Structures are given as C-alpha cells and as structure tokens.
Amino acid sequence: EDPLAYYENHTSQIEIVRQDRSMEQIVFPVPGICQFLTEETKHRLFTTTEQDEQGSKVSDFFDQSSFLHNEMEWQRKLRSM
C-alpha cells in the first residue's frame, strides 16, 4: 500500500565497537524471516534472561540467538499451513 512502508518498517540501526575502540552506527535492512518472531517468545526472553558474573546479560542473549532463528524458521513453515 504505502510505498515507504516495506523499505521503512524493515530497517534498523545498532551500535558496535570495533577493534580500534571507535564506536560506529550500522543501519541495515531487516530480513523477512526476522519479522516472524512471536511476541510471547520476545516477552519470555526479556524476563527470563539472567545476569552473568560480570553483570552483563549480553552473553545469555547471544547464546539463544540460534534457538530464536530456528523457532522463527518453524513459524514460517507453520504459517504456510
């Protein structure tokens, strides 16, 4: 419908730190598979995550990224039926 919807909703930005410690902002498109993530899984990840020894929860979040990708893939196949 709206021309600036498929190219707008499927866009995101993040923050990273490179080897030289110089922070950069990356703007990248959102792949179609990522749009199929279930809200209930999103809520569970936000609440169930636990802090590590350093107090940074990023390690736990990254470790479950593969599971989320597989869950999204099943959701796409489920949506087919």
Binding site: S12, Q13, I14, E15, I16, V17, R18, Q19, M23, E24, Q25, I26, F28, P29, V30, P31, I33, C34, L37, K42, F46, T47, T49, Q51, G55, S56, K57, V58, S59, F61, F62, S65, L68, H69, M72
Partner: protein, 222 residues
C-alpha cells in the same frame, strides 16, 4: 495462577530446611518418648472408642509410645501433657511430671514448630527482595550496555529513546540473523568484522558502559 505459584515457592525454595527441622522435631520426640517409657510409662493412658475398657495403656512398647507422643503430642496445642492423665497435685511425682510437660511445651511446640514457620517468613522476605531487585534492574538499566537511567540526564537523547532505538536488543538480534544469512562475498566492512568476531566467540563488539548519546558531550569535548 502465578501468585499462587509464588506463594508455593515460599515453602519450596527452603524445603530442605523445613524437612531437616522436621527431622529435629522427630529426634526430640524420640528422646521424650524414651524418657516417658523409662520414667512416666504408667501415666501414658489413652481413651479409645471401640466399634460394635475405654482407656488402656499406650506406651507398653517404644514404637507405640513414639506414635502416641508424635501423633497426639505435636497436634495438641499444649503438647504431650494434654494427652496424658491428669496428675495429682499431692502425688510425689507431681513436680517431675510438671517439668516434663513444660520442657516439651518450650522445646517442641515453641522453638521447633515455630522455627518451621520462621523459615517460611524468611523465604517470603527473600523472594520479595529478589523480585524487587530484579524489577528495578530491568526497569532502570538497559539490556545491551547496562547503563543506569541517571546517566541519561540533561542530554538531548533521553533514556527512553536510548533503549527504544539506540540500544534496541532486537535490532542486534536481527543483525545476527542477517550476518548469518548473508553470503560471504556480499559482506561489507562492519558486517565482515562481526562475522569474524562471532566465529572467534569473543563477545566484545557489544557496547558496554558507553553509548553515542552520552559521547555527544565527549564529542563536544573532543
């Protein structure tokens, strides 16, 4: 119901302590039963109704005595003394019996069963404190870099927009999927770096204790 589950968690978390306290209660009952069998065996009389004498001894053997003391002693508010026959005040053994019940009342009902209750309260306070801390951390610091809310003060970019867009974790997850899905030949500068870092299993590219919003003042200082 989650609230009911939390209430049950108040006794489940410290279940081991409750069980051990029960074991201590059983041990104390065992000692008291032995003492009764040695000294106050005669006084152990129990009333029973026979289906189609009313009172008879119940401490003839040690096993029956412990069941009588444990079953009818802990449940009764007074303790063991209530179930036993009323002692005559002028009886010679009156003082020994009086001390016996009072010790049981002050050793098995006030400082044993009450301890089990106290464990439950301690768990209740512990659960509430843990929940309060977890909620405060979740609502006060952002997931990716973990900076506190107070840092984002008197700045152009507020905390709400810092987490919504600047440090949105789902955006990082989307990037992970994109990097995994995209081909090697199509990788760009930043995408190639993270892909190399992910293969190295080093989780350092994630920003920590720093963000561009606060670095804006640093940029002005630069």
């Amino acid at each position: 119901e989650e609230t009911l589950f939390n209430v049950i968690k108040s006794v489940t978390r410290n279940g081991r302590s409750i069980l051990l306290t029960a074991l201590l209660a059983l041990i104390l009952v065992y000692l008291f039963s032995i003492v009764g069998f040695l000294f106050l065996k005669d006084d152990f009389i129990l009333e029973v109704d026979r289906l189609p004498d009313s009172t008879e001894r119940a401490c003839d053997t040690l096993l029956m005595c412990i069941v009588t003391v444990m079953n009818h002693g802990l449940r009764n508010g007074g303790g063991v003394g209530d179930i036993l026959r009323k002692p005559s005040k002028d009886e010679s053994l009156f003082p020994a019996r009086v001390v016996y019940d009072l010790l049981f009342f002050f050793i098995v009902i006030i400082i044993v069963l009450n301890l089990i209750f106290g464990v439950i309260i301690d768990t209740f306070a512990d659960l509430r404190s843990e929940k309060q801390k977890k909620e405060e951390i979740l609502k006060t610091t952002c997931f990716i870099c973990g900076l506190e809310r107070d840092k984002f003060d008197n700045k152009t970019v507020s905390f709400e927009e810092h987490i919504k867009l600047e440090h949105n974790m789902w955006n990082y997850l989307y990037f992970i999927v994109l990097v995994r899905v995209k081909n090697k030949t199509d990788y760009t500068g930043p995408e190639s770096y993270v892909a190399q870092m992910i293969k190295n299993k080093n989780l350092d590219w994630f920003p920590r204790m720093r963000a561009m919003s606060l670095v804006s003042n640093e940029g002005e200082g630069e």
